[PDB]
Design a protein around this nucleic acid. Structure first.
Ligand SMILES: O=P(O)(O)O[C@H]1[C@H](OP(=O)(O)O)[C@@H](OP(=O)(O)O)[C@H](OP(=O)(O)O)[C@@H](OP(=O)(O)O)[C@H]1OP(=O)(O)O
Ligand SMILES: O=P(O)(O)O[C@H]1[C@H](OP(=O)(O)O)[C@@H](OP(=O)(O)O)[C@H](OP(=O)(O)O)[C@@H](OP(=O)(O)O)[C@H]1OP(=O)(O)O
Ligand SMILES: [Zn+2]
Ligand SMILES: [Zn+2]
Lengths: 454, 384
RNA sequence: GCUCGCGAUGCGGAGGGCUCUGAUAGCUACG
RNA sequence: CGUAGCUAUCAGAGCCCCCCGGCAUCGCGAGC
């Protein structure tokens, strides 16, 4: 018991309360203390829990670590261990995303502050942790209804927080490319550089870290948290509710006329999508035509962390992958929990998804069931908006600069097919999942991308 | 004495309460604190001397969604009547082992070889369920109070609420109708905060009145067993209880051989028990004849206070089943459906039971009472 | 008879804070 | 040999606070 050990090692020490937040099941307190001058702090739904976490950080920073559970240990990154110790990096990206969300929700007082899952991307440009910069913040836990599908890219299909955070990261990447291409003097401020292999690549030591308030839905969450000590099957998000179901071993692909006749939309679980990002990269196909693949360096979970299950879901399940195109690889990012894990909130999920990217003046609210904003307009993150930004970048880069030839792009799906290497890596990933017995990836009907900007 | 229905009701209530008292140091143990008491009593003849208390239990809570076990080590539902059925299952396993021990021991077993294959109860062996209050759901929800003589019977029998399948809801109050277009529960969804739904006790008892009390696994060895009587120690309402236990699904059809829609005696007691003051205990006691002592389980975690699995958990029952299965010659099994040794698949080997369960679900659906809400499938996907 | 909407009065598992009693455990101080 | 004080846990009893989504009774409006 950290409070007991700190109270006996430093008998005269006294704890200091700060301020409570939320209400009922979502309420949480923040306690602080000052032993030998350091300003230790912790948090929990009840003050005695926050008390123990503040005393825990105090005992760790002034003495040694407590009786840490083995599954709670973090599988360290396969390479690139430069952003200090993994727990300090985890707690830093976690507090940064929570604080940016508090700024975007007027100190959690706005109606959109109530949420189940919170997500965000953090960028580090150097060895020091002071250099962190929040890139995107999002919330969401629902998917578009089958009847609200857009045949011209105006509706978001998946609004789970981590998915929306990646789309916001894509908005930041388009901004950085335009930042480099709009002026010669601004090239030093961009995160990109021209690559010796053609196109662009990230500047040295630029890293993105993903934070989710809970383990990603799907395979990463199929374990019993209270009995730690097993089949990485692919799963699809179910319609009418949170949670996933394994993909059927004998199921035909989605049809556009069938999503409105009987079959519910089958979106892949977030766990499978992050493994997919660990192979083909987080930039998607269109951005690959301009830049080299980008991968997350870390995956920080605010709750439901487990090293065996999360590592099995993020990459160990598809270690049999092979013959990847050059630059592509099986990412093995740092996986870690946090010192102040969130408590479970038993209750119904919100119908709205919140999203924000650095440089935006405010958050964007989306109705996850319809894939559009509360007043029926297309989202900044929708396919059509992304393709619009991509077209803007395509009209400024010389044809020789492109990593894949694609003169006069028109229909969205064809521009995606122009990324031959990304498509090849995606094919390798699909065969890896099949060869491992985890099932075949479910793809949405092609009519979903059969649209031109015109 | 003889067994005039009210005589029987009073006898079983006195026996279950008395046995609980014996087990709690004349109700002086800390574990004697209870809101709801349940039990199972066995009869053999007309002589009340032959009455036998089989199990006794207490509890009014169910598992916290975060504590679900993917190894079958946690009790999911600690409502007293549910725990009492599980304790009876332990008794049934023990009785099969008694039959299998030797030719001499078989005479004492409540089981006999069945001419239809496997085993059945010896003639006039009966089980009686006691609950100190009306089971939650359809029997309880429309009148959670002691009946009074000037109170008219249900004045709105035709309301659609009447007879509906209902679920306990995690951290919620009361019970709820299954929703329209009922959503499949998932393990990861519950872990993230989707509230765990559990079928009400009224619905579970109706289930037992079709598929029997022994469950699928025991049905691989034995023919369906039914309660002969259902005795409530308080809040008895004849019309509500009769609907809940069987009348609401009188539309059931195509049951497999030996299955039936069972209509046991329903009765209150002459001296109804009282409401007990006190915060309801977060724990649940269970005991089966032959056990030295009660076992105390934290209902929220589904485990004992030191985190050990209950003798009633899925894993423990699967272990009992495997031991009996290893002793029964193949030609005596009631089903010859071979299944991989994972609890879920072993349950699937009980083909006729699964069919009866399906007929039950359809009966509810066709009557307009909703669709049965199952646990996430991952719950039963474990092996020993 | 029922269904739906609004109102009113009631009935039946969670989270948080505060306070009082007991038991266990560790630590002080004083005579 | 005592007393007093501080913690940490459990165990129980009170003051609340905030939920949850059903059910009963009655009223009003509408439909079948
Ligand atoms: O971020 P998501 O919501 O998961 O959207 C992705 C993303 O689609 P967009 O970038 O066009 O929005 C993928 O695009 P790329 O990885 O190709 O850049 C696309 O993959 P494909 O074009 O390779 O099919 C995939 O589609 P699918 O689910 O059919 O695999 C689709 O996922 P959702 O349709 O679930 O949104
Ligand atoms: O009512 P309980 O005593 O809690 O146990 C039952 C029992 O499962 P266990 O015997 O494994 O404890 C049912 O199985 P059978 O005995 O009828 O074979 C099972 O239903 P299934 O057979 O379909 O698994 C049902 O759970 P569910 O209906 O949700 O699947 C489950 O009750 P709980 O899930 O409420 O614990
Ligand atoms: Zn998800
Ligand atoms: Zn009940």
């Amino acid at each position: 018991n950290p409070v007991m050990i700190l109270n006996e090692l430093r008998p005269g020490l006294k704890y200091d309360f700060l301020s409570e937040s939320g209400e009922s099941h979502a309420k949480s307190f923040v306690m602080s203390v000052v032993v030998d001058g350091q300003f230790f702090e912790g948090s929990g739904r009840n003050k005695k829990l926050a008390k123990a976490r503040a005393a825990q950080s105090a005992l760790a920073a002034i003495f040694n670590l407590h009786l840490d559970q083995t599954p709670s240990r973090q599988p360290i990154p396969s390479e690139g261990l430069q952003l200090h110790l993994p727990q300090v990096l985890a707690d830093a990206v976690s507090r940064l995303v929570l604080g940016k969300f508090g700024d975007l929700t007027d100190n959690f007082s706005s109606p959109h502050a109530r949420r189940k899952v919170l997500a965000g991307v953090v960028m580090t440009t150097g060895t020091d942790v002071k250099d962190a910069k929040v890139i995107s913040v999002s919330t969401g836990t629902k998917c578009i209804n089958g009847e609200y599908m857009s045949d011209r890219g105006l509706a978001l299909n998946d609004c789970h927080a981590e998915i929306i955070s990646r789309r916001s990261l894509l908005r930041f990447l388009y901004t950085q490319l335009e930042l480099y291409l709009n002026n010669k003097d601004d090239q030093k401020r961009s995160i990109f550089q021209k690559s010796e292999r053609g196109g662009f690549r990230l500047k040295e030591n630029v890293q993105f870290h993903l934070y989710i308030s809970t383990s990603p839905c799907g395979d990463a969450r199929i374990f019993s948290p209270h009995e730690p000590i097993a089949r990485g099957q692919l799963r699809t998000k179910i319609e009418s509710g949170q949670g996933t179901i394994p993909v059927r071993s004998n199921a035909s692909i989605q049809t556009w006329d069938g999503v409105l006749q009987g079959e519910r939309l089958l979106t892949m679980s977030c766990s499978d999508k992050i493994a997919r990002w660990n192979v083909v990269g987080i930039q998607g196909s269109l951005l690959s035509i301009f830049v080299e693949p980008i991968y997350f360096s870390s995956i920080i979970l605010g709750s439901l962390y487990h090293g065996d299950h999360l590592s099995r879901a993020m990459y160990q399940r598809i270690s049999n992958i092979e013959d990847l195109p050059p630059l592509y690889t099986l990412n093995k990012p740092l996986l870690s929990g946090i010192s102040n894990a969130e408590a479970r909130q038993p209750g119904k999920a919100p119908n709205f998804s919140v999203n924000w990217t650095v440089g935006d003046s405010a958050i964007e609210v989306i109705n996850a069931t319809t894939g559009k904003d509360e007043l029926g307009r297309a989202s900044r993150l929708c396919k059509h908006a992304l393709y619009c930004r991509w077209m803007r970048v395509h009209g400024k880069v010389p044809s020789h600069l492109l990593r894949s030839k694609i003169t006069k792009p028109n229909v969205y799906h064809e521009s995606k097919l122009a990324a031959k290497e990304y498509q090849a890596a995606k094919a390798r990933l699909f065969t890896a999942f099949i060869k491992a017995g985890l099932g075949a990836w479910v793809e949405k009907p092609t009519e979903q991308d059969q649209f031109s900007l015109t």
